[PDB]
Design a protein around this nucleic acid. Structure first.
Lengths: 294, 159, 169, 58, 218
RNA sequence: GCUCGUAUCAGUUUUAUGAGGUAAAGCGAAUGAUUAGAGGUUCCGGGGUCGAAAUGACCUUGACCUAUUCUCAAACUUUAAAUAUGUAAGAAGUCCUUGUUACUUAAUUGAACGUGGACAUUUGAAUGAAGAGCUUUUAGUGGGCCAUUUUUGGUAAGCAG
RNA sequence: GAGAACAGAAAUCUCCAGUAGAACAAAAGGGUAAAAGCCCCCUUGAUUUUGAUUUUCAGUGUGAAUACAAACCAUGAAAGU
RNA sequence: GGUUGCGGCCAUAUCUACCAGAAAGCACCGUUUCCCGUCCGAUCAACUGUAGUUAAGCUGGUAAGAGCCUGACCGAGUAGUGUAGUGGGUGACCAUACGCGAAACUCAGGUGCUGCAAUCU
RNA sequence: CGCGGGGUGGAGCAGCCCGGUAGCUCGUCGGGCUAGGAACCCGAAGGUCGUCGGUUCAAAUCCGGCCCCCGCAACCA
């Protein structure tokens, strides 16, 4: 009885929004994220969109118009190898680094870089970008998590912490960070700092080397191949931090080709729609063959 | 007894639409309203806060006040033998811009452009609008169009 | 082709639907917990009927779900009491199957006079890799027809594995 | 002794005797009902622009 | 004892069906709307004769049942039960009301007059329009006179004016006689239980092949 | 009477732009009614062979699946008029480096109000305007009734609404 | 709909279909699907001050409601509410 | 042109059934020390991107496909309707005059378009 | 003619209100030692509920379509 979908059912069906059908955007949350105070007439509302694919992180600073969203700046985790992070390009430390990169990129673009210099010596403590006296207020963004699950110790809040320490004023509480304890409502600065600097992966490396060598050879094989040690990954994460705060300018790639060449090849492969004349030809051939019994 | 509540006899007026129920798309929130804008009022049945009364459904007014999630609209309501000023505090879900003035602004821009071209050359702009004039003389031919004579048809049952 | 669409057990659910609540359900939960190595969850009545002696929200039943090698072990130890003799009636149209057994002591649990004898209903939910598509949060989808489990492939898999046999009718 | 209950007969004619002339519009409509934060700033800004205009043409 | 039909002849009120708000109305006096060889194939009864209304009025269920009985009786008497198919094509859905009161000397002692005079259901009527068919009889062309005479007999039970029109269609179809003939010597028509199924130039070709094979295997 | 003097107008059209759920229509479109007719096992009814064994298997009345266009709805509806109805058709208008602000903005970003600057003899559809606008004060009235059209109760009424 | 001991029309469990045909204190009508339904976590904004506004309207009152202002709070990561 | 993140309009986008998908991307996928959440690492959380696969998702193509959208002198100037007569008809109702004017039906065509950013033989 | 009671074994009353559906009185034969009887209660049959759609809590009593006086109905003319 599964296939009882009458023409009346298909006629009275109201299809959801396209992004709701695709299961990509939550419009209930988007309305409250995007609806600006009307007496703040056209001043845009900025979202720090954070998305986590497999083996990649996407951080964007996005404003909204009627014709569609507009991107201010974008920072992908796959670009972090240029700054000095190649492994774990989706873990918590990489989320923090990508958030730091997007905040620095946005401040470089807006000219608010020297003022609101950010937190260069992070300690895993709770702190917001304090506005300077008689000076421009910090660039304010609101975290957009999409459908991801808000839970303590999540990499969305990792990217949040990275951007806030980079210099963006993004309002947040500290109870979603790693190090926050439920029984005692306090934040562990050292646990948060270790999660910032890759301690939660170095510790796993140590334990896995101690107990199960096969797992260490299987996963962390890139770490072994590059001869990266648990004591040195903290150094590489902080070196990436300083590199990002040095040159966040976003040099793009070369594409190795032209849009025209990509278009020509992909179009040549892709299946082409049948013309209406050949559609009628196929129908009439079916009449002539199947009905005629040859 | 009789019942005259706030939403009395609004059964179909505030009905959402056919296959247009559910959430409200975000352009209605991205639209901005300034004091002096002319706005049509059409209540959204889905949103029950800042709802206009059924009198103001389909009425066009002028913004006088902009707040966090609302606009204040001036409307001239006919009461007795005169018009009274009414000030509605409506939400942008029920508010929408009016094209009645926008056509006029397009025409005034075109009039200014023609005025400038006249100040340049003097070619009888004829800015003023005019009603449809009676049709002028034309010559219709029969070449390939010989008239077809028609006659009334006889009555037949058809049933 | 069949790169990774080979059948696997998504989960195995053991339920005992006691008539009432109280000590009987407590001991049914105890035996289910002992058999599944984990705490089970108790299910209350959806509505009230006087004939069955149930009220709304009255904790009618206890059920537990297991996954992996433990699910396989419990399934085979419950098939032993069936002597590996199931029926195409027991196999479902959506590719899952199940069978009910009584006298749970046959699974290898010693009798205790307080606990008594309890019957359960094994139900195995069969699937192949890719059900995360229909079970995840973001970008939900429905599995394709080729990837969909079926009665025929499930009975074939069940008579291939465990070298078992499905009854004619 | 029942009587007539209601009618709108003759009401429109009575209204139109000296009736439905449109409302008298004014330049500078009243600011009543406007956001008081905006009204505060408008008071301050009008004070400032009056001072500036006096300084420009004293 | 029921009220004379002159009191309910005309369509004075809005349609007042039995519904969630009436919920207690009498049963219609006419319950059977198909008579004769109602199972006959469309090819069997090519001729159709209509008794159609020429007035905007209300036809009682009582009158509908009486006229149906009369016409059916005449056709079965003269030409036989399996010689025709009669279809009553108006269903009495409008409910008539009555303000009932005692009718005796000193009746003003319980009447209350026109106060609270809303009526209660006491009948059913079919609301017919100008040119709306009341009766439709399909039969062979040999039975034309029998059928028109039976409809003429049925006309006496109805108020107002009615006309007997020989339809240009084939039986109870909406196809003219020669157009249906052409469509039938082609392969477009198909025999259903009693009506005719049509073949269209739309839909899935596999289903079109599965049905109507004579058109395609030509 | 007052302030003015042909407009700080109009029981009208036009043009542009809204709103509506009535008339109609529809029901092989939702809901609720509603008349007929194909095949399937009697687990998902009853009436019967191949009886001391099912679901090898078939006929009737009926129940559900289909594909069906018989008829409908003041308190049903996808669609949807006509007539009525809101707004606009300028000088209090259109456009410009923004001067002020304790509002707002990441931000001389906006918001509002402004100075200054470019624009009449065609100042931006039609028709009329028989002066326009504005007060003050007070009479009588506050039983109504009839006609066309829409319409409710009632068999109806020179009935009631 | 298919399936699983007792278990059947109705008990618990599992998949599929499912535009809401459910539910939302009550009448009815509107409205609502990653919610306005169900479940869980936290909570008291059902708070203070005095105005403006809509409906009935005489543009009186009463009742109800609407959008802010200035506070003080709740919730949430936050936008917000 | 492909893909993704964020979207605008919200079916030309939906639904059913079959096919194809290079690259990259997306994805499925592997693991359980930590943060975290469950009867159940199934979801959710974390880690690896390593062990593998385009099977599925996703994208596209196909279908005298259902639905949807657009158009028509298609139906139809029909139904209805404003205005008029000391028009017809016992009446029910109807015709005409000056205007406005459908819905169903039939046929035809179509089956997402597009913005910001990144990225790919 | 006023929503007022059911058309329940041959007759008059339960059961209608909580779900495997013959509950009291008449007759036919036994019960039972009787000496016949009179009487006693125990069993067999006797109601398939005036009757159409059911939405199946197996509905036809707790959905709906037609006759019967009653717990009684006036008001001043």
């Amino acid at each position: 009885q599964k296939d009882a979908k009458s023409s009346a059912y298909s006629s009275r069906f109201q299809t959801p929004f396209r992004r709701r059908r695709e299961g990509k955007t939550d419009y209930y949350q988007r309305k409250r994220l995007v609806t600006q105070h009307k007496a703040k007439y056209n001043t845009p509302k900025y979202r720090l969109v954070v998305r986590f694919t497999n083996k990649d992180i996407i951080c964007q600073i996005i404003s909204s118009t009627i014709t569609g969203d507009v991107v201010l700046a974008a920072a992908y985790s796959h670009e972090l190898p240029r700054y000095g992070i190649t492994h774990g390009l989706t873990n918590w430390a990489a989320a923090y680094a990508t958030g730091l990169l997007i905040a620095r990129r946005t401040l470089q673009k807006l000219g608010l870089d020297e003022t609101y210099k950010g937190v260069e010596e992070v300690e895993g403590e709770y702190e917001l970008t304090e506005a300077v006296e008689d000076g421009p207020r910090p660039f304010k963004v609101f975290l957009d998590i999409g459908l991801q699950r808000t839970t303590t110790g999540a990499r969305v809040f990792g990217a949040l912490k990275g951007a806030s320490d980079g210099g963006l004023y993004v309002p947040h509480s500290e109870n979603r960070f790693p190090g926050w304890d439920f029984e005692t409502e306090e934040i562990d600065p050292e646990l948060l700092r270790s999660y910032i600097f890759g301690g939660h992966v170095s510790q796993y490396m140590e334990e896995l080397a101690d107990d199960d060598e096969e797992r260490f050879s299987e996963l962390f094989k890139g770490y072994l191949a590059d001869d990266i040690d648990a004591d040195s990954l903290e150094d590489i994460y902080t070196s990436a931090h300083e590199a990002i705060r040095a040159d966040p300018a976003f040099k793009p790639t070369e594409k190795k080709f032209t849009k025209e060449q990509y278009a020509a090849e992909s179009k040549k492969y892709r299946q082409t729609k049948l013309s209406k004349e050949e559609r009628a030809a196929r129908v009439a051939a079916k009449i002539a063959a199947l009905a005629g019994q040859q | 007894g009789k019942s005259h509540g706030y939403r009395s006899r609004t059964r179909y007026m505030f009905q959402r639409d056919f296959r247009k129920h559910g959430a409200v798309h975000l352009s209605t929130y991205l639209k901005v309203y300034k004091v002096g804008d002319i706005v049509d009022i059409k209540a959204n049945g889905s949103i029950q806060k800042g709802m206009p009364h059924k009198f103001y459904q389909g009425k066009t007014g002028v913004v006088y006040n902009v707040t966090k999630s609302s606009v204040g609209v001036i409307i001239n309501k006919m009461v007795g033998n005169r018009y009274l000023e009414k000030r509605l505090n409506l939400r942008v879900e029920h508010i929408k811009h009016s094209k009645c003035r926008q056509e006029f602004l397009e025409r005034v821009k075109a009039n200014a452009a023609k005025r400038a071209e006249a100040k340049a050359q003097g070619v009888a702009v004829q800015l003023k609008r005019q009603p449809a004039q009676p049709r002028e003389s034309r010559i219709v031919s029969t070449e390939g169009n010989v008239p077809q004579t028609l006659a009334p048809v006889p009555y037949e049952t058809f049933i | 082709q069949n790169p990774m669409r080979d059948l696997k057990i998504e989960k195995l659910v053991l339920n005992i639907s006691v008539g009432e609540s109280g000590d009987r359900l407590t001991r049914a939960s105890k035996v289910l917990e002992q058999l599944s190595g984990q705490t089970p969850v108790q299910s209350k009545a959806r509505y009230t009927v006087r004939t069955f002696g149930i009220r709304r929200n009255e904790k009618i039943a206890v059920h537990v779900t297991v996954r992996g090698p433990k699910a396989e072990e419990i399934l085979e130890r419950g098939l032993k009491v069936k002597e590996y003799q199931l029926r195409d009636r027991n196999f479902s149209a959506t590719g899952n199957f199940g069978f009910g057994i009584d006298e749970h002591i046959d699974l290898g649990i010693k009798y205790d006079p307080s606990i008594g004898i309890f019957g359960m209903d094994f139900y195995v939910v069969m699937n192949r890799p890719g059900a995360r598509v229909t079970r995840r949060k973001r970008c939900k989808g429905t599995v394709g027809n080729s990837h969909k489990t079926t009665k025929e492939d499930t009975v074939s898999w069940f008579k291939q594995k465990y070298d078992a046999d499905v009854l004619d009718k | 002794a029942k009587s007539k209950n209601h009618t709108a007969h003759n009401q429109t004619r009575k209204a139109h005797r000296n009736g439905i002339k449109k409302p008298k519009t004014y330049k500078y409509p009243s600011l009543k009902g406007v956001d008081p934060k905006f009204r505060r700033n408008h008071k301050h800004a009008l004070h400032g622009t009056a001072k500036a205009l006096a300084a420009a043409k004293k | 004892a029921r009220r004379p039909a002159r009191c309910y002849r005309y369509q004075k009120n809005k349609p007042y069906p039995k519904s969630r708000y009436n919920r207690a109305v009498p049963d219609s006096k006419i319950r059977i709307y198909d008579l004769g060889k109602k199972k006959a194939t469309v090819d069997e009864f090519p001729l159709c004769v209509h008794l159609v209304s020429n007035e905007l009025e209300q036809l009682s269920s009582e009158a509908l049942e009486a006229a149906r009985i009369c016409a059916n009786k005449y056709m079965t008497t003269v030409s036989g039960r399996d010689a025709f198919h009669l279809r009553v094509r108006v269903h009495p859905f409008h409910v008539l009301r009555i303000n009932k009161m005692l009718s005796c000397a000193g009746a003003d002692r319980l009447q209350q007059g026109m106060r609270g005079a809303w009526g209660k259901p006491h009948g059913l009527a079919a609301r017919v329009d100008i040119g709306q068919i009341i009766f439709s009889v399909r039969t062979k062309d040999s039975n034309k006179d029998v059928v028109v005479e039976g409809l003429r007999r049925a006309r006496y039970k109805f108020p107002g004016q009615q006309k007997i029109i020989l339809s240009k269609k084939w039986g109870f179809t909406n196809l003219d006689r020669p157009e249906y003939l052409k469509k039938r010597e082609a392969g477009e028509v198909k025999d259903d239980g009693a009506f005719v199924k049509f073949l269209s130039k739309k839909g899935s070709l596999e289903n079109n092949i599965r049905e109507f094979p004579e058109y395609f295997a030509a």
